[PDB]
Amino acid sequence: STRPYPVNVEAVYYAPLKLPIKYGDLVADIQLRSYDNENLDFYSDFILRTGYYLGIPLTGPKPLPTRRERWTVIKSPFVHAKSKENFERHTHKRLIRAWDTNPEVLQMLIAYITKHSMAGVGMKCNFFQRSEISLDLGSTSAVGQKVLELLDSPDFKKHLEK
């Protein structure tokens, strides 16, 4: 008998598994951004594997439009504004959506993937919580205070006198 390779090890060599969406209740939107795609894609694949074992139906990574920033410089330090060099930066974006999951399990996903994050990858998470119209116990500016103080000071009260 050869050495048995269990399903957990085999899964690592194949595309991440996805759980079917039953109801379609969008619970979270995780957008990942990086200046390079390679770590972004690898990390996105890891998130899908983490969610599967947690029981979270996940979709994506959906590629969002890449943003391009551009800067044009003059190569010479002092004069010669006729030769200009071009520079650019590309923001790569990916969207992973979570469905039909309880808030506690969703927080476990975010905690785990935060602990094992990759270099140069940023993450924004929009959480969607469906609530009742009427809740129990619910869910002054600095400038204004100074104005009141100033209008009580003698340099201002001396005029307001009617």
Binding site: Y23, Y53, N102, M118, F127, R130, S131, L135, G138
Partner: protein, 272 residues
């Protein structure tokens, strides 16, 4: 034990290399707060054979330091082997970066093989909130590992027809919402980032919702039934987007021209 390096009295009886490892840990962890200890020196003298260092030198090295060793050496002039020939025993720094990449991959592979499966113990069945008792949706935002001002922003969105308002009260609700109501989609959406914490902003939107609902359900003085709904704000938004509202004419469809599935005996025979 973790604290063993702090108890040189307990080092007696440990193997030679373990004592040296505990001697090196006490120096690294204490640094400028390191003071020679007799027990520590006694244990190190027991390793004079594992290292073949004269028992006398150990004592000097233990009290003098690098200077002591330089004296034992007899000089401080060691050949400058900075351009020595390559012995094909180390990798270039650029190849060591590709090995680091592979060390990271294997680290993640190992987590996915043996650590992620353990997360299945925490699976919880989805306790779906009834779509009718929970019509309001609060969107929260979190920028992980960052301080971002927008993290405070909270958004509230609900379908006006799911608020349980009568016909006249529903009309008053939509009139008072003004630009916050989209008749096309029937969505009433209001966001607030005025406060510093999202919890504060969530309550603020909740309180406004209760106030708007109370006013809309109090039709004792005015019901605003004469006032028609104003959609000018929605029209302006629609003009800024492109509308592909054209479909293929149904009377142009020719279903009789579609390809007809052919008979394949092999597939028909392979199924039996």
């Amino acid at each position: 034990s973790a604290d063993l390096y702090m108890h040189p009295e307990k080092w007696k009886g440990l193997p030679p290399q373990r004592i040296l490892e505990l001697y090196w840990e006490r120096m690294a962890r204490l640094g400028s707060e390191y003071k020679p200890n007799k027990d520590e020196l006694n244990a190190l003298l027991t390793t004079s054979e594992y290292s073949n260092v004269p028992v006398n030198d150990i004592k000097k090295l233990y009290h003098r330091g690098e200077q002591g060793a330089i004296d034992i050496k007899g000089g401080n002039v060691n050949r400058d082997n900075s351009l020595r020939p390559f012995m094909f025993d180390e990798l270039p720094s650029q190849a060591q970066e590709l090995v680091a990449q592979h060390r990271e991959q294997r680290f993640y592979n190992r987590l996915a093989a043996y650590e992620l499966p353990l997360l299945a113990q925490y699976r919880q069945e989805y306790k779906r909130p009834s779509p009718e008792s929970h019509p309001v949706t609060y969107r929260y935002t979190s920028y992980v590992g960052e301080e971002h001002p927008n993290s405070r922003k909270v958004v509230l969105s609900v379908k006006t027809k799911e608020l349980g308002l009568e016909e006249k009260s529903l009309h008053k609700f939509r009139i008072l919402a003004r630009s916050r109501y989209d008749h096309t989609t029937d969505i009433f959406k209001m966001s607030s980032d005025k406060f510093e914490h999202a919890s504060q902003n969530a309550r603020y939107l909740h309180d406004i919702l209760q106030r708007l609902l109370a006013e809309s359900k109090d039709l004792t003085e005015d019901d605003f039934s004469d006032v028609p709904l104003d959609t000018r704000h929605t029209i302006a938004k629609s003009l800024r987007k492109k509308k592909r509202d054209y479909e293929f004419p149904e009377h142009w469809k020719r279903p009789e021209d579609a390809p007809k599935k052919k008979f394949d005996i092999v597939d028909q025979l392979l199924s039996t």
